Amino acid sequence: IKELHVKTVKRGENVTMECSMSKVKDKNKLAWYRQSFGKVPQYFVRYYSSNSGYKFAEGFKDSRFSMTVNDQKFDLNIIGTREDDGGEYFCGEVEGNTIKFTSGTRLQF
Amino acid sequence: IKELHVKTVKRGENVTMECSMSKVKDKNKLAWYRQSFGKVPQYFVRYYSSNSGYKFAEGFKDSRFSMTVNDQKFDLNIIGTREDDGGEYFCGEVEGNTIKFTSGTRLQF
């Protein structure tokens, strides 16, 4: 049972939340999930074969968010963190009938 | 964006956590996810094509858990809840490259 990284930030800081490509078997099934307090997690960005390597859920628009995607890394970034970024972020690969979460971060203020 | 049901329970109660079958494309794609504080979510029980209607994750052994699976209902039950059941539970439907969570409960002692 895998432990979350804890990132304590202040408003205006930058953050990168890590996820490894190392055991991934289908990058098309990799996505990042966000869970805010009192809500269900939600997928907000996934792998996308392209030069950037990712793509955002429909009508997720926040320019502060990006990703750094390559054969090692599937890393999620926030430039200019605000109190409302607070919550948990999980990186998950879908496999058959279930998803496996291989890492996640609790982002806190 | 779906709200979690927040239940305050006392030790030794029985709990039922809800999840509807009403829009499920492929029932085999449904599972329940446990997220303890500080941890990544983990699938621990799924729909199975059986009469009981569910199968535990290999490595999950906690006989206090069961499910009520019918044609309306993918509910999770615990008999004798204890403090360390505290945390979040999500019902997830795999639909492709991502999972959607249609339901979840937070249990608090």
Residue A84, min C-alpha distance to chain B (Å): 15
CA distance A35 to A86: 9
Q: Where are the domains of chain A?
A: 1-109
Amino acid identity of residue B60, one-letter, is F
Question: Which residues in chain A have Cβ-Cβ distances shorter than 8 Å to B4?
Answer: 38-40
User: Which of A60, A74, A38, A57 shows the shortest CA–CA distance to B96?
Assistant: A57
Which pair of tokens denotes residue B70?
A: 């019918």
CA distance A68 to A18: 10
Q: Thinking of the domain A1-109, which architecture would CATH place it in?
A: Sandwich (2.60)
Which pair of tokens denotes residue B78?
A: 């615990």
Residue with tokens 């993918």: B74
CA distance A107 to A1: 19
Which pair of tokens denotes residue B1?
A: 């964006």
After which residue numbers is chain A interrupted with C–N beyond 2.5 angstroms? none
Residue B55, min C-alpha distance to chain A (Å): 12
* CB A53 within 8 Å of CB A47: yes
User: What is residue A39's DSSP assignment?
Assistant: B
Print burial letters for B32-54: b (CB count within 10 Å at least 16), e (below 16): bbbbeeebbbbbbbbbbeeeebb
Out of B41, B43, B98, whose CB is closest to A43?
B98
Residue B29's φ and ψ, nearest 5 degrees, are -80, -15
